[PDB]
Design a protein around this ligand. Structure first.
Ligand SMILES: Cc1cc2nc3c(=O)[nH]c(=O)nc-3n(C[C@H](O)[C@H](O)[C@H](O)COP(=O)(O)OP(=O)(O)OC[C@H]3O[C@@H](n4cnc5c(N)ncnc54)[C@H](O)[C@@H]3O)c2cc1C
Ligand SMILES: Cc1cc2nc3c(=O)[nH]c(=O)nc-3n(C[C@H](O)[C@H](O)[C@H](O)COP(=O)(O)OP(=O)(O)OC[C@H]3O[C@@H](n4cnc5c(N)ncnc54)[C@H](O)[C@@H]3O)c2cc1C
Ligand SMILES: Cc1cc2nc3c(=O)[nH]c(=O)nc-3n(C[C@H](O)[C@H](O)[C@H](O)COP(=O)(O)OP(=O)(O)OC[C@H]3O[C@@H](n4cnc5c(N)ncnc54)[C@H](O)[C@@H]3O)c2cc1C
Lengths: 553, 553, 553
């Protein structure tokens, strides 16, 4: 058998179910092996979508996901989605098909040196030079991404896919995909205990690193009476049913999070790399991170701790003294609810009758009507504001995929294609901005071909009729222009048993920016301390804020 | 004044009229300086289009063209178009806006290291670290691309655009954009004279390097009675009104070019880097190239000559003896016309009544109806076959832009946006494949915004209604399904004074591939000598073939 | 036969006589093929020396020179010498032996990715992946460096050297190594003519680009009565027998060059990339360079010309008007001789009796005693000052090799090993600094092994006895401590028919630095205009200065 056959057999034995990619001639031997296997080829019409779809699938499943591209220009289109996947921590293998080995170094038709292009967006990237070495580096690529070291790329000269397979020595191996339990160094954990016991008031600020530490964070918060704020990456895990909830920091922020973080005697950063330093205090900060290289990237950290959040809290809890004074927690919960109530009153008074349709009204209804376990994908831009302030996660059963770190546009539909491919019976909603729809046609043609029943909600601030474009491409569509019809039309679109594009004509003057917000602040290089956020209201998060006030002892 | 103001003033003083790009927040100071200048910002809705549009503009004008992108993901979208522009020899400066200098090295939001990504697709790529150094490297970037050394990239941390301008020392300089006259080394030129005088029969094979050498190539051919064949890059310059015409080599080839090249006593490669070595002889070859590093890249070369084609022929002509025997030239001209007549008879007999519409019928009519000075842009894929075999260049007044070397898909509309922006009164036709239309929407929205009257001819082998999609995006469209209506409907679409999308439903089974053509041959790594080309007919080129037979003495 | 045999046969057929390198196990197949060939392996004891020796050989012969290194750490030692060779324009091929192809991508023992390390110090660098492709990229590497495009590197996985040779298609080719004749663009040449005719006074400032243009530069100078100054790279070609000589600019400078350059109505930079902009005027400058990308790198250039210096002067001379007024030339020649006489009087009055020995006294005697056709190699540091101010080139028959652009230390003995290997009957003098002798032992052991009769002149400012070290390593040595014995002892050492190390105890307080020279000026980032040079005298150059005054009409 050939190396193309061995590559596909190896992926199949490891549980890979799909490969995303646009087929080109250099991939033909690999596509032929996939056709004879149990793996499904997912044909993306835009080559740039393949790596976002694989990234989104891996984020949903926790398992390896795979994308592929043809030689030269083909694998150049992997770069954006691989930066996004790599920064998001998605476990992706990219099969970068390459020119024939005989043409390397001759400035051949389509020739590139793909190893140079993926150096920053991967943990492992090597070229195959034969079947035996190709089997070996395929193992190393999978083992590197499954051990959490980043995206992996295997560059395969087209002709070598047809050469003989290796002998099986590396494909026979079991991949380590376990989660080690990382306890902190006792000296660092003792310094954190002392910092907490010496502080009269503590605030916890959580990011994506608290994903598997909800119970420990909440147990710690109840013991020391600490308000809990979050970065955007931690919103989905820690905001829901949180008795200590004080919102989010940054320009898309809300509530008393910036106040609680800067007024507490001690701030504890838990599993976060929140980059907007002008919102963070410097006086007295602790930071717990599983990657020690991340500690102190964003502000002065006096109590650094390398370790897992859950294992670190479990280790310090018997030595942390109970704080009976919750004056600070009560003050912050009250200020939090007043801040949310104030932005609702200032910006969304009688928003249900606003014409053209207010996007915040759409987001509020969308939060109510979407399924309790829906996946939301979020296009970079204004949709990040609507997700942050209106899309909630009751009981933690929704999933959220976006380009929160790499910040690239037009990611929602490619992410949704991967997320929807995991389970066709699960609802997937893609929040799309009209500006991020220049590549819409290829995304719709992929959705139509694979019958992926995702719901593309377009915040149309153009005038372009996206409902007519979707209908011409063979996709069911609806156009919403009257605010009194949003609930009815959205409920009917979300109930459609198939792919739908929902074209909602929204008000282009929605983004409210206070006169004090500068270009330096927007760009993230303003030094002066700030508590200023973009204008606009908030949604259903106010219900938890209000129950937390009623439950104050 | 600021460095952003100085950058725009410098480009404006050098004759730059447009900057192509998608505006993002990191570019705001530069966009503000453009607004107050005589330069027009051309807003591309797909960021990937900017570098193709600049590349196409530079190929048409011969002058500097400029594209720009916002930080991180933004300048990652420049890569495809910059590889294409760099390989095509287009003189492009890319303004790669970058994250704030204070965040470099902190894994900030959107952070990339753009210097690593452009190393292979540029001749110069440096980062600005202040206003004074920024003025200097802007000069060096422009001087490098104007001297023919490749694409140039200037990476500008967003905050530095607002810092003070340099003192003018480098912006005050005159750029050398001249064309030196490169005569060959007399020893190399003497060896070429001897090779020609010792050969009884000679064939010339021309590429893009004969652009300014038509008269010299034809004068040499008449003196030694040599058939003249071409690579695809040389078709536009040497095929028209050529009394020695014997067609093109490679799988998209036609006529007796492969026979004449391999049967002549001496083959002279003139200004070509044709990469399909299995079509080239090895026994006795000369090669003239202005870049000595390119000589002998593709086959055995015994008579290498570094120099300009026109200056080299002028230098050797007084020493080359007149060949009175034209038996070989006559045999090749006769075989050439029989080969063209044979493929017309085999593949396009009664093609005017073929249903669904034959793409070769569309291409033939398009060649007749398009203006004598039209620009054609060619989408990579089947449109390369139709351009090569049907779109002619009478009197050399048409221009052709495609991704002939980098071979990336979806280039036709981005190339056409740049070409059309040069002169709105000049016809621009974009030959689009239905597979290369996943990014169509953003291209149409740019064309609509700037009122660019290009004609997008879509070879629709899908069923998708692209005419309805174009009409929904606010673009005039027509749908052609009946072959007897192609001439009338195409003539009316080409006459429309504005942008039009022409959706032509064509036969998806057009590509004829002989059973002997292997995947190795398609991929370009088959070693065995070949004369086999893809099936299909040829167009109006047969008229010149037939006049050349009538003019045989 | 094997690819190792084919590589050596190919180099041998192209006239390669030596390969410099330290043999390691990964090179064994290549070393075995060299042993059975006419090529000599030159064993360098310090692997870092190999690339400097090849660079020096190529500078002396004008032909390809070759170095080799073993895998991993071995080819890492090529980098310094390859930056030096690449910047000096030496035509070098480096054979970078690499780990076995089966281990690539496995973090094997000694594994590196050598392609990344040579990107800036080469014009071509590719990896061999088989015998056929290896033959092809060997051709491309040689053709790139012989066409003047920079150093070339061929990376060869150790095991592939034992695989079968390619079929000969590329090794059968003739390499283009000719010198094209580059005439300027007539528009640029016309602007240069106008600038010269409108100026009342002109100064020419020449660099290494005037190597083959002495007669044209001197003919132009006589016609327009222009003083001729030089950068250090042009000293060896234009200073000797020059009736217009006005010295050198920069901190190591001398004479009226800075004055003549800044006081003339027009400055013409001819074949120079002199980097110390604070010594250059900005008001009215022309620049002629064969590489257009270099034009205007260093100051404002209003009259840029891309072209060869000799061809450009030949083209403009019939249109340049004769200037009969030589008031400026006479004033500059007089000021030049007064400046040289003044530094001799200020710094070297009675230097023949100075104790410890003055290095300027050593340099003056060395200039007199060395052969008329000697090669001088110059260690970076104080030896650059002594070469610049004391080592002359009567009739142009001496050669000079140094690290003038890359500026790396300890280059003199590795450069001298390559230069001496070209012709054992030609005198080679290496000017060594005591600080640049930490790697002396390996250099002496190579010189002893190959019986290279070079003369290592050590300016010993330590106390270390280098004569005793050389004697212990088996090399003839002499120690000079008395200034009255320098002439006699140096004459006897230079006459020794074999390698000699001459240990001269010199005064460590020789470097005179005026109180106005700042660290910014030493580092090359001071903006203010300057005419200040380091203290110290000059040598035999004063004889030409004085004859030029006597010959003033
Ligand atoms: C248009 C736009 C606007 C934005 N505006 C904002 C804004 O106003 N506010 C905002 O908050 N964000 C904003 N973001 C996103 C922002 O740039 C950051 O990506 C985000 O704040 C980071 O969230 P995080 O810290 O949860 O995740 P990450 O940056 O991924 O950090 C997670 C950290 O947890 C660590 N970790 C992982 N697992 C564990 C574990 N088991 N134990 C311990 N540590 C662990 C990781 O090593 C890492 O350091 C914006 C994004 C976009 C696209
Ligand atoms: C789908 C597809 C299929 C293709 N199939 C074919 C095919 O079958 N046949 C085919 O021919 N092409 C084919 N091509 C294109 C092919 O890959 C090459 O790009 C093309 O053949 C190169 O043309 P060229 O030699 O004219 O241009 P280039 O490769 O650009 O070479 C031009 C040469 O001229 C030299 N030069 C420039 N100016 C001068 C001067 N003044 N004097 C001297 N030398 C000078 C340059 O240094 C260079 O070496 C295909 C492309 C695509 C997208
Ligand atoms: C310790 C130290 C101190 C130094 N101090 C000084 C100092 O004070 N003064 C000084 O002058 N140097 C000094 N140097 C060297 C300095 O850094 C430069 O390397 C040197 O001045 C450059 O000389 P150049 O212009 O002749 O050569 P290059 O920089 O090599 O420039 C040659 C130019 O000629 C062009 N060219 C080549 N062939 C042709 C042709 N046929 N026609 C046209 N153009 C052609 C090339 O493209 C190039 O642009 C120092 C070096 C060291 C190690």
């Amino acid at each position: 058998r050939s190396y193309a056959e061995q590559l596909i057999d190896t992926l199949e034995a490891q549980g890979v179910k799909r490969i995303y990619g646009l087929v080109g001639d250099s991939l033909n031997p690999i596509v032929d092996a996939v056709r004879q296997s149990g793996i499904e080829w997912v044909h993306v019409r835009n080559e740039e979508a393949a790596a976002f779809a694989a990234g989104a699938e891996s984020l949903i499943t926790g398992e390896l996901a795979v994308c592929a591209a043809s030689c030269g220009p083909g694998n150049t289109h992997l770069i954006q989605g691989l930066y996004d996947s790599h920064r998001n921590g998605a476990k992706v293998l990219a099969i970068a098909s390459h020119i024939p080995s005989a043409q390397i170094g001759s400035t051949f038709f389509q020739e590139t040196h793909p190893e140079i292009l993926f150096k920053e967006c991967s943990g492992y990237c090597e070229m195959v030079n034969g079947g035996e070495q190709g089997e070996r580096i395929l193992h190393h690529a999978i083992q590197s991404t499954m051990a959490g070291k980043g995206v992996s790329v295997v560059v395969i000269p087209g002709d070598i896919a047809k050469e003989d397979a290796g002998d099986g020595t590396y494909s026979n191996s079991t991949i380590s995909s376990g989660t080690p339990v990382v306890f902190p160094d006792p000296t660092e954990a003792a310094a954190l205990v002392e910092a907490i016991n010496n502080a009269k008031s503590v605030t916890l600020f959580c990011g994506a690193g608290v994903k598997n530490a909800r119970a420990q964070v909440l147990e710690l918060a109840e013991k020391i009476k600490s308000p809990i704020g979050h970065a955007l990456g931690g919103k989905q895990y820690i905001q829901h049913e949180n008795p200590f909830e004080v919102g989010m920091s940054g320009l898309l922020g809300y509530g008393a999070c910036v106040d609680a973080s800067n007024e507490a005697d001690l701030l504890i950063l838990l599993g976060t790399d929140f980059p907007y330093s002008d919102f963070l205090p410097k006086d007295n900060v602790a930071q717990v991170d599983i990657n020690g290289a991340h500690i102190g990237r964003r502000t002065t950290v006096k109590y650094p701790v390398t370790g897992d959040v859950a294992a670190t809290i479990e280790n310090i809890l018997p030595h942390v003294k109970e704080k009976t004074d919750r004056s600070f927690l009560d003050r912050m919960l009250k200020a939090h609810e007043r801040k949310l109530s104030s932005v609702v009153e200032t910006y969304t008074h009688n928003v249900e009758k606003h014409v053209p349709i207010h996007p915040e009204y759409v987001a509020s209804i969308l939060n109510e009507l979407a399924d309790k376990d829906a996946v939301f994908t979020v296009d970079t831009g204004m949709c990040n504001v609507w997700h942050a302030r209106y899309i909630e996660n009751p009981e933690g059963t929704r999933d959220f995929v976006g380009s929160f770190r790499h910040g690239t546009m037009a990611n929602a539909l490619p992410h949704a294609i991967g997320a929807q491919s995991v389970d066709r019976n699960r609802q997937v909603i893609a929040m799309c901005g009209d500006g991020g729809l220049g590549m819409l046609l290829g995304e719709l043609l992929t959705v139509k071909l694979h019958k992926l029943p995702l719901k593309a909600v377009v915040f149309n601030n153009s005038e372009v009729n996206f409902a007519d474009i979707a209908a011409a491409a063979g996709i069911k569509s609806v156009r919403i222009t009257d605010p009194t019809k949003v609930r009815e039309q959205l409920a009917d679109a979300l109930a459609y048993p198939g792919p739908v594009l929902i074209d909602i004509v929204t008000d282009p003057n929605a983004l409210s920016i206070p006169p004090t917000i500068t270009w330096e602040q927007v760009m993230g290089f303003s030094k002066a301390a700030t508590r200023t956020v973009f204008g606009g209201g908030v949604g259903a998060m106010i219900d938890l804020a209000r129950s937390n006030i009623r439950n104050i002892p």
